[PDB]
Amino acid sequence: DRVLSLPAVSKNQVLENVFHTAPKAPVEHLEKMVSANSKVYDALNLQSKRVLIWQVKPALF
Amino acid sequence: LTTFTFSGLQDAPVAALSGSIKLNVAAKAGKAEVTVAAGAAKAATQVSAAALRKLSGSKISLAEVARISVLHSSIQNYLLS
């Protein structure tokens, strides 16, 4: 019964109770907010190719 | 607008109200000495009292150039706001 003096918590259980969640990378915030502020740039700049300012306040020719 | 307008060089603006563009006129007995400047440019032309009455002869008649409609752009503008 040598096995009953070893720690009963396996190395698997340590590795799954210590690294429980896959941690958030810091570049995920950058790439997500950049891919959404590209849409903020596209709609709302006055130099984008697809501005909303002519679909919203049309013109007066 | 109507086909006949009765405005011009009688109780006209004799001065500008901003700081961005300078207007001064000399309303004489017949004509006006209008000289204007807006930043880097100068403009000094001569208008008569009957020169502004000819101005409303053909109307400008502005109109919205919309992507779909003026109605649709107003609803889209409210959705954007």
Side-chain angles (χ1 to χ4, degrees):
Chain A
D1 43 356
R2 281 292 193 224
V3 75
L4 305 188
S5 291
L6 291 189
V9 174
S10 300
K11 184 61 162 199
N12 174 40
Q13 287 189 3
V14 177
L15 281 193
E16 86 186 8
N17 284 248
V18 159
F19 310 134
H20 43 88
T21 313
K24 294 260 197 187
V27 78
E28 188 213 1
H29 186 74
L30 189 138
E31 62 190 295
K32 276 185 148 300
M33 300 299 273
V34 159
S35 59
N37 295 353
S38 69
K39 282 143 54 167
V40 180
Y41 169 78
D42 281 16
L44 305 160
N45 198 59
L46 273 302
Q47 280 93 18
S48 177
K49 294 309 163 210
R50 325 172 286 145
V51 207
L52 292 204
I53 199 64
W54 315 112
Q55 330 188 355
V56 153
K57 287 270 174 46
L60 269 193
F61 275 91
Chain B
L1 256 290
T2 76
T3 54
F4 291 114
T5 311
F6 308 107
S7 295
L9 282 200
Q10 288 294 108
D11 311 86
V14 288
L17 267 80
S18 66
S20 296
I21 168 172
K22 282 188 294 297
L23 175 137
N24 53 85
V25 296
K28 306 173 290 186
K31 294 185 54 163
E33 298 289 330
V34 47
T35 297
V36 287
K42 304 285 192 223
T45 185
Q46 296 295 322
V47 296
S48 55
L52 291 190
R53 311 299 311 275
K54 293 187 189 176
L55 195 62
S56 66
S58 298
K59 307 276 163 43
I60 288 289
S61 88
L62 294 171
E64 317 272 332
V65 177
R67 178 159 169 268
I68 290 178
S69 298
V70 189
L71 166 72
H72 179 95
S73 310
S74 59
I75 299 178
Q76 182 178 6
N77 179 31
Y78 183 57
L79 285 177
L80 184 81
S81 304

